[PDB]
């Protein structure tokens, strides 16, 4: 119970496109379509999270006049060492009665820092991407918003008009198979698998969730012999891998991605990637259409261009004089692909005139304007603009 | 009422630099310096307790430190934190200090006691906090771009974060021993003293009363007082209690780390001039500003440079388009005219 | 539930109340040390170190 209009627009956000709906035996219809946003959300699989590690060192066991013994503890990066011939000094002299027969048991292990819930990087496995689009349509003199998945199998009905967006011509994504996420920044990184991190590098400590309980650690923790008459636990360890990636990470994908991709998080997605085209299907109901006989008839048409500038914007002005049979709404459309008209619909009266705004790149613009069902020839001499570089895209 | 400080106490611990590069048993010893906060805030752990008096009462103008066997009161105003230059202290509670420090290679925390003797502890610590955003600014603005950052909250509240605590070890003290004509006299002074002598008869035990060791020299004996009444942080700079196994306790700590918002300023828009397939920008930065650019096509060719002073930049604008980011400002987009 | 040698008691209600630490500081800390692994440790810590 209606007419299906199928058209294809380039995948470019912020550019209004004009489409002519021509149902046989019915008056032409002009629809303005503009992509507000195009979102590419990939499916994520969290491998692990990384953060700053914590070296837990308790009070050393100083055995005076005896030998301490190291116990094998099931802890990440657990290190134990008994040092012989120690003579530690405290505030009121020597801590031990014996001169040489004293031992110090030094113990240490690696665990997640308190910061891990606040400061962390996540390692994700990115695969197939779900495309979605937000489209603005100038339908019946009003702006309607349509939000649909760009797969070609998701019908969204707004004001009785059924919309089918996609499928996308390009399956391109700025994300690789392996990605790293830190706050509002996403990085394409071939991160080390889980259980294989290196010391002082990204993944020196790997846990599955910021609150998991077991954790993997490879920090090269080695305990050293304490200083003469000093109670302390000296050690050699590779510095935080997270804290160093955070310094040498470089520019995120928001800055490095091709096609002018905007990168957002929570969830991670590619916004406004200017790649390929987008097919659009609109099932316009029968009630919206009006017959050619029922629509006003146009005769004795003439076109004059008092002002024109060939630029990206509507730098052209055209005055079209007409003779109409009756009062009603008439659709305005350019029959020449090199010229685009700003207005989609105008109110016709009788022996009056209409004013339209047009955009062209040609210095000598020869174009036909279809007002309702009659065409009028426009002759335009357009001049160059003051600026060579523009801040907004055009058709 | 709840006061965790009734059980805990300030202590003396090893410090590698107490002044002029000499090691000492410091009452202001540094335990751990935390720098997880992206805003630059440092969470410093010290051996003394700030905001608590010797009688356990909470007083923000007071400080509690270990004064040779017994804790003593000191002024909060006398407490100082410094790296290469003095730091700005943002919060103090117990063993913890919150401070905003300039670029440095060492970290010093000190105070002034009763008899005006300044005690300080210097530890080697590389401090150079990373830049938040794309502009290296000095002073924080009221209004600007909202970017995610972390800090240690000023709240006193005891939740989330924690530290391990245990009973302190036997404190050696040679003043407990004296010579009674030519023998060894151990004066208990209403304390529990553990003693060991290199002589016959009696040389062991934990005593609550005065003991005498006949035909023994003062150098041949060792005496230590036992403190089984209070709690102390599980410090690697203090020895473990020998007459106790793996017995430990835990207490909640102030100022935990949490995500907040950092206000960043936007560099002034440069004077823009256009040409044939190219853009010219006259940059006037007040501070180091990151300038980045990319093509909006198949080959983005990302390039970046930190602009320090007055510089003119000539960039080629391709048919696909050019995106330019000048500091914390929103990216500028350029396209050539048909 | 919290532990005290061989009795078993509610964490928020230790038998030493009121002034657990003031009456006997040694046995209060020993009791707290025996309940570190228990989930209701902080309920016991709050009650033991509270007095007016
Ligand atoms: C439909 O939406 C468009 C875009 O928001 C509106 O177009 C114009 O809106 C203003 C004039 O009313 C101008 O300030 C804008 O420059 C202009 N924008 C574009 C892209 O042409 C239009 O008025 C809307 N029509 C409705 C709501 O009936
Ligand atoms: C901090 O980290 C992230 C925001 O970056 C958020 O998911 C989390 O809940 C925050 N947690 C805390 C404890 O601040």
PDB file of C-alpha atoms in Angstrom, chain A residues 52-54 56-62 65 73 87 89-98 105 107 113-115 117-119 182-184 229-233 243 246 250-251 253-262 272 274 310-313 361 385 387-395, chain B residues 12 14 25 32 34-36 38 68-69 134 148-150 160-162 164 166 169-174 196-198 220-222 233-242 246 257-259 274-279 292 294-298 300 302 304 317 323 325 331 333-338:
ATOM      1  CA  UNK A  52      50.530  -0.728  38.385  1.00  0.00           C
ATOM      2  CA  UNK A  53      51.841  -3.630  40.528  1.00  0.00           C
ATOM      3  CA  UNK A  54      52.482  -3.629  44.333  1.00  0.00           C
ATOM      4  CA  UNK A  56      54.266  -6.493  49.339  1.00  0.00           C
ATOM      5  CA  UNK A  57      57.230  -6.574  51.756  1.00  0.00           C
ATOM      6  CA  UNK A  58      56.509  -7.449  55.443  1.00  0.00           C
ATOM      7  CA  UNK A  59      58.875  -6.895  58.428  1.00  0.00           C
ATOM      8  CA  UNK A  60      62.073  -9.021  57.984  1.00  0.00           C
ATOM      9  CA  UNK A  61      62.517 -11.989  60.348  1.00  0.00           C
ATOM     10  CA  UNK A  62      65.810 -11.279  62.168  1.00  0.00           C
ATOM     11  CA  UNK A  65      71.630 -16.429  67.635  1.00  0.00           C
ATOM     12  CA  UNK A  73      54.737 -19.987  49.399  1.00  0.00           C
ATOM     13  CA  UNK A  87      74.642  -7.725  62.885  1.00  0.00           C
ATOM     14  CA  UNK A  89      71.620  -2.032  64.934  1.00  0.00           C
ATOM     15  CA  UNK A  90      68.524  -0.327  66.392  1.00  0.00           C
ATOM     16  CA  UNK A  91      68.023   2.922  68.436  1.00  0.00           C
ATOM     17  CA  UNK A  92      69.476   1.516  71.698  1.00  0.00           C
ATOM     18  CA  UNK A  93      72.376  -0.442  70.195  1.00  0.00           C
ATOM     19  CA  UNK A  94      72.601  -3.935  68.621  1.00  0.00           C
ATOM     20  CA  UNK A  95      69.326  -5.890  68.167  1.00  0.00           C
ATOM     21  CA  UNK A  96      71.100  -9.295  68.568  1.00  0.00           C
ATOM     22  CA  UNK A  97      73.193 -10.630  71.505  1.00  0.00           C
ATOM     23  CA  UNK A  98      75.460 -12.745  69.202  1.00  0.00           C
ATOM     24  CA  UNK A 105      64.878 -13.795  56.525  1.00  0.00           C
ATOM     25  CA  UNK A 107      60.384 -12.056  52.107  1.00  0.00           C
ATOM     26  CA  UNK A 113      47.934  -2.153  43.598  1.00  0.00           C
ATOM     27  CA  UNK A 114      44.997  -0.314  45.290  1.00  0.00           C
ATOM     28  CA  UNK A 115      44.983   1.867  42.106  1.00  0.00           C
ATOM     29  CA  UNK A 117      40.244  -0.344  40.183  1.00  0.00           C
ATOM     30  CA  UNK A 118      40.822   3.348  39.179  1.00  0.00           C
ATOM     31  CA  UNK A 119      43.987   3.311  36.954  1.00  0.00           C
ATOM     32  CA  UNK A 182      42.765   3.247  28.583  1.00  0.00           C
ATOM     33  CA  UNK A 183      39.958   5.613  29.778  1.00  0.00           C
ATOM     34  CA  UNK A 184      38.861   7.523  26.624  1.00  0.00           C
ATOM     35  CA  UNK A 229      73.930  -2.835  60.823  1.00  0.00           C
ATOM     36  CA  UNK A 230      70.738  -1.832  58.959  1.00  0.00           C
ATOM     37  CA  UNK A 231      67.239  -3.378  59.262  1.00  0.00           C
ATOM     38  CA  UNK A 232      65.672  -3.102  55.756  1.00  0.00           C
ATOM     39  CA  UNK A 233      64.687  -5.316  52.773  1.00  0.00           C
ATOM     40  CA  UNK A 243      53.448   3.273  34.111  1.00  0.00           C
ATOM     41  CA  UNK A 246      51.502   5.166  29.791  1.00  0.00           C
ATOM     42  CA  UNK A 250      51.995   7.559  21.521  1.00  0.00           C
ATOM     43  CA  UNK A 251      48.937   8.937  19.820  1.00  0.00           C
ATOM     44  CA  UNK A 253      43.437   5.909  17.171  1.00  0.00           C
ATOM     45  CA  UNK A 254      41.312   9.118  17.598  1.00  0.00           C
ATOM     46  CA  UNK A 255      44.423  10.862  16.108  1.00  0.00           C
ATOM     47  CA  UNK A 256      45.946   8.111  13.851  1.00  0.00           C
ATOM     48  CA  UNK A 257      42.860   6.445  12.159  1.00  0.00           C
ATOM     49  CA  UNK A 258      42.196   6.993   8.394  1.00  0.00           C
ATOM     50  CA  UNK A 259      38.918   8.362   6.830  1.00  0.00           C
ATOM     51  CA  UNK A 260      38.570  10.965   9.650  1.00  0.00           C
ATOM     52  CA  UNK A 261      37.355   8.405  12.252  1.00  0.00           C
ATOM     53  CA  UNK A 262      36.241   9.736  15.653  1.00  0.00           C
ATOM     54  CA  UNK A 272      31.848   9.152  11.357  1.00  0.00           C
ATOM     55  CA  UNK A 274      34.107   8.613   5.818  1.00  0.00           C
ATOM     56  CA  UNK A 310      30.636  28.943  -7.644  1.00  0.00           C
ATOM     57  CA  UNK A 311      31.414  27.483  -4.179  1.00  0.00           C
ATOM     58  CA  UNK A 312      30.724  24.518  -1.801  1.00  0.00           C
ATOM     59  CA  UNK A 313      27.719  26.386  -0.253  1.00  0.00           C
ATOM     60  CA  UNK A 361      31.240  24.442  -9.072  1.00  0.00           C
ATOM     61  CA  UNK A 385      34.897  33.041  -4.227  1.00  0.00           C
ATOM     62  CA  UNK A 387      38.619  31.622  -0.215  1.00  0.00           C
ATOM     63  CA  UNK A 388      40.507  28.671  -1.803  1.00  0.00           C
ATOM     64  CA  UNK A 389      39.990  26.305   1.205  1.00  0.00           C
ATOM     65  CA  UNK A 390      36.529  25.583   2.749  1.00  0.00           C
ATOM     66  CA  UNK A 391      35.749  24.318   6.330  1.00  0.00           C
ATOM     67  CA  UNK A 392      32.635  22.264   5.271  1.00  0.00           C
ATOM     68  CA  UNK A 393      32.200  19.409   2.691  1.00  0.00           C
ATOM     69  CA  UNK A 394      29.893  19.434  -0.400  1.00  0.00           C
ATOM     70  CA  UNK A 395      28.487  17.109  -3.148  1.00  0.00           C
TER      71      UNK A 395
ATOM     72  CA  UNK B  12      61.454   5.013  64.581  1.00  0.00           C
ATOM     73  CA  UNK B  14      65.651   3.355  58.965  1.00  0.00           C
ATOM     74  CA  UNK B  25      66.885   5.931  63.042  1.00  0.00           C
ATOM     75  CA  UNK B  32      56.138   4.353  50.512  1.00  0.00           C
ATOM     76  CA  UNK B  34      52.390   6.552  45.716  1.00  0.00           C
ATOM     77  CA  UNK B  35      52.080   8.388  42.352  1.00  0.00           C
ATOM     78  CA  UNK B  36      49.091   6.675  40.652  1.00  0.00           C
ATOM     79  CA  UNK B  38      47.236  11.428  36.963  1.00  0.00           C
ATOM     80  CA  UNK B  68      63.485   7.879  72.032  1.00  0.00           C
ATOM     81  CA  UNK B  69      61.188   5.091  73.535  1.00  0.00           C
ATOM     82  CA  UNK B 134      47.587  18.401  25.003  1.00  0.00           C
ATOM     83  CA  UNK B 148      39.214  12.152  32.929  1.00  0.00           C
ATOM     84  CA  UNK B 149      41.890  12.118  35.694  1.00  0.00           C
ATOM     85  CA  UNK B 150      42.559  10.461  39.116  1.00  0.00           C
ATOM     86  CA  UNK B 160      38.320   0.895  50.802  1.00  0.00           C
ATOM     87  CA  UNK B 161      42.181   1.144  51.124  1.00  0.00           C
ATOM     88  CA  UNK B 162      44.122  -0.567  54.005  1.00  0.00           C
ATOM     89  CA  UNK B 164      48.945  -4.271  57.618  1.00  0.00           C
ATOM     90  CA  UNK B 166      51.385  -5.929  64.107  1.00  0.00           C
ATOM     91  CA  UNK B 169      59.692  -6.012  68.200  1.00  0.00           C
ATOM     92  CA  UNK B 170      61.787  -6.028  71.460  1.00  0.00           C
ATOM     93  CA  UNK B 171      63.465  -2.584  71.745  1.00  0.00           C
ATOM     94  CA  UNK B 172      67.184  -2.921  72.762  1.00  0.00           C
ATOM     95  CA  UNK B 173      68.285  -0.539  75.552  1.00  0.00           C
ATOM     96  CA  UNK B 174      71.748  -0.612  77.207  1.00  0.00           C
ATOM     97  CA  UNK B 196      70.770 -12.469  77.759  1.00  0.00           C
ATOM     98  CA  UNK B 197      74.265 -12.659  79.406  1.00  0.00           C
ATOM     99  CA  UNK B 198      77.508 -14.419  78.303  1.00  0.00           C
ATOM    100  CA  UNK B 220      78.855  -9.439  78.034  1.00  0.00           C
ATOM    101  CA  UNK B 221      75.076  -8.740  78.500  1.00  0.00           C
ATOM    102  CA  UNK B 222      72.144  -7.728  76.194  1.00  0.00           C
ATOM    103  CA  UNK B 233      52.621  -0.680  60.664  1.00  0.00           C
ATOM    104  CA  UNK B 234      54.103  -3.886  59.123  1.00  0.00           C
ATOM    105  CA  UNK B 235      57.251  -1.938  58.090  1.00  0.00           C
ATOM    106  CA  UNK B 236      60.167  -3.588  56.205  1.00  0.00           C
ATOM    107  CA  UNK B 237      62.436  -0.991  57.974  1.00  0.00           C
ATOM    108  CA  UNK B 238      61.574  -2.413  61.479  1.00  0.00           C
ATOM    109  CA  UNK B 239      62.295  -6.109  62.465  1.00  0.00           C
ATOM    110  CA  UNK B 240      59.502  -8.696  62.992  1.00  0.00           C
ATOM    111  CA  UNK B 241      58.555  -9.894  66.527  1.00  0.00           C
ATOM    112  CA  UNK B 242      60.565 -13.101  67.258  1.00  0.00           C
ATOM    113  CA  UNK B 246      52.755 -14.699  61.246  1.00  0.00           C
ATOM    114  CA  UNK B 257      42.392   6.941  44.856  1.00  0.00           C
ATOM    115  CA  UNK B 258      39.258   7.732  42.730  1.00  0.00           C
ATOM    116  CA  UNK B 259      38.410   9.044  39.208  1.00  0.00           C
ATOM    117  CA  UNK B 274      44.381  29.986   2.741  1.00  0.00           C
ATOM    118  CA  UNK B 275      46.100  29.091  -0.561  1.00  0.00           C
ATOM    119  CA  UNK B 276      45.916  26.667  -3.545  1.00  0.00           C
ATOM    120  CA  UNK B 277      45.491  23.178  -1.900  1.00  0.00           C
ATOM    121  CA  UNK B 278      47.267  24.484   1.275  1.00  0.00           C
ATOM    122  CA  UNK B 279      46.596  26.113   4.700  1.00  0.00           C
ATOM    123  CA  UNK B 292      48.820  17.377  15.191  1.00  0.00           C
ATOM    124  CA  UNK B 294      46.123  13.976   9.386  1.00  0.00           C
ATOM    125  CA  UNK B 295      44.601  13.462   5.905  1.00  0.00           C
ATOM    126  CA  UNK B 296      40.918  12.357   5.826  1.00  0.00           C
ATOM    127  CA  UNK B 297      41.575   9.661   3.175  1.00  0.00           C
ATOM    128  CA  UNK B 298      43.149   6.182   2.715  1.00  0.00           C
ATOM    129  CA  UNK B 300      46.235   9.654   6.898  1.00  0.00           C
ATOM    130  CA  UNK B 302      49.849  11.348  11.034  1.00  0.00           C
ATOM    131  CA  UNK B 304      52.885  15.699  15.481  1.00  0.00           C
ATOM    132  CA  UNK B 317      45.141  20.192   2.115  1.00  0.00           C
ATOM    133  CA  UNK B 323      42.108  17.536  10.080  1.00  0.00           C
ATOM    134  CA  UNK B 325      44.317  19.691  16.188  1.00  0.00           C
ATOM    135  CA  UNK B 331      39.921  19.610  15.608  1.00  0.00           C
ATOM    136  CA  UNK B 333      38.665  20.479   9.329  1.00  0.00           C
ATOM    137  CA  UNK B 334      39.852  21.806   5.931  1.00  0.00           C
ATOM    138  CA  UNK B 335      38.699  20.912   2.368  1.00  0.00           C
ATOM    139  CA  UNK B 336      39.788  22.382  -1.036  1.00  0.00           C
ATOM    140  CA  UNK B 337      37.276  24.350  -3.178  1.00  0.00           C
ATOM    141  CA  UNK B 338      36.089  22.651  -6.426  1.00  0.00           C
TER     142      UNK B 338
END
